[PDB]
Amino acid sequence: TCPFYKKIPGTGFTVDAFQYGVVEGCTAYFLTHFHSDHYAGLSKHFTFPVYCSEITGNLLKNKLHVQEQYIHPLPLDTECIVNGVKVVLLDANHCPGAVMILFYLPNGTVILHTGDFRADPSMERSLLADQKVHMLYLDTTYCSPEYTFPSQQEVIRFAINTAFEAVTLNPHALVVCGTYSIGKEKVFLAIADVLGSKVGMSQEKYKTLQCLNIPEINSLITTDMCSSLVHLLPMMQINFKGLQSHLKKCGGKYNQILAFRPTGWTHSNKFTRIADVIPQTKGNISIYGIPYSEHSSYLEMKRFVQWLKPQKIIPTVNVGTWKSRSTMEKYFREWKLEAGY
Ligand code: NI
Structure with missing residues (x-):
């Protein structure tokens, strides 16, 4: 049963959720990048629309033998519509074809899903600059001061x-x-x-x-x-x-x-x-x-989030234990205090 943190509320969309069979009420499955844990369960027999970058599409086609009709390449840094909702894909500075996804919800809410990323100052001069982010779904792979x-x-x-x-x-x-x-x-x-x-x-x-x-x-x-x-x-x-x-x-x-x-x-x-x-x-x-x-290193992550000033953060890595979840909370609180936001 697909976790909450792979669901974009208000839409019929999921992100990186292919290993749950058919998800109840999902009209479009987004794939952030072509790594095995993220695409797990995709194959030639998948029959619903998959939204992804060009490069990610080449790879779904030629390596996984997914049928061309269900692959929906989108270009980067371009305002696009999908099932009535405005989206943008941004370069994630992770692996070739990896993206971040901006969702602009019907109710005026804005949601950034980072997928896998390595934060960089250049990101501050993109479409992300132009408006406020309500929820951030964050790659927390290295969320600890020693990294x-x-x-x-x-x-x-x-x-x-x-x-x-x-x-x-x-x-x-x-x-x-x-x-x-x-x-x-x-x-x-x-x-x-x-x-x-x-x-x-x-x-x-x-x-x-x-x-x-x-x-x-x-x-x-x-x-x-x-x-x-x-x-x-x-x-x-x-x-x-x-x-x-x-x-x-x-x-x-x-x-x-x-x-x-x-x-x-x-x-x-x-x-x-x-x-x-x-x-x-x-x-x-x-x-x-x-x-x-x-x-992202710890410092890279921290700087990025402090710039973005999201209202709510949802981690997508190291989420399975209470120890990890609680430790990350602690750091996000420290970052907010240090800033004031
Ligand atoms: Ni990855």
Whole structure:
């Protein structure tokens, strides 16, 4: 039975609610982005309208084999009507095709659902600026003071320099990046660009990337593992055993591997600065752990909410326990006091 926090009151709409069968009274199902927990239960047999970004539509079509008649791509930053209600999709700065959704309700109420997002100052100069928000449905993945991380920009800079260096010392070294769904593509496309290479990967993942409206993508990727000095592999395979195994499967063309794991947060954000970072090494194989987050840090979240001044906040992550719910309440109260709103 679909939870309240996936329902937009006053409408027949839900958000990211596909794993409940047919929801009683839902005329339109919104999907914020193409990640598995959020699209869970979508398939070729789904028969009701799905509202989403272009990129999210490409992916529902080509990967999930959803029938073209039930996919309703909407453009970003544009006032659109759906079943009598004015909506806007905004870029969520999360993964390719991820959106936030503004609902302007018949009764003059306005509702922002963030889906998954990583808050950024640029958001303050969008359609969100122009009016008051009554309810906020907030991605609270990192809602606790200990979650600090560096900027996406700082992290990609580190990984570029580290890769360039290792391959200039040894031009038969290979670079491997871990992946398991969309998002974090900027890590590996940036590395391949500096190095003058295409990015080699499997057929399934090559497909995924063709859906994402990247300019000139065909010139940047390949399934030729032998004509490629950057390769993608499942995140699980990013350990000493996996990397060795894969090194034997290229045809003696590389004699070393430098590999990257874009993790979210782990306990060494609380001490190690990015410039200090050093890899674990074993023979001719090296693994750097980099904190590339696609969600708001605590400070990012706090600043965003304080700007927005919503009347009510509804969390959409870490909601299952009383501990978590109560802890988040505490922080939202602190933010409100500190501001005055
Ligand atoms: Ni996500």
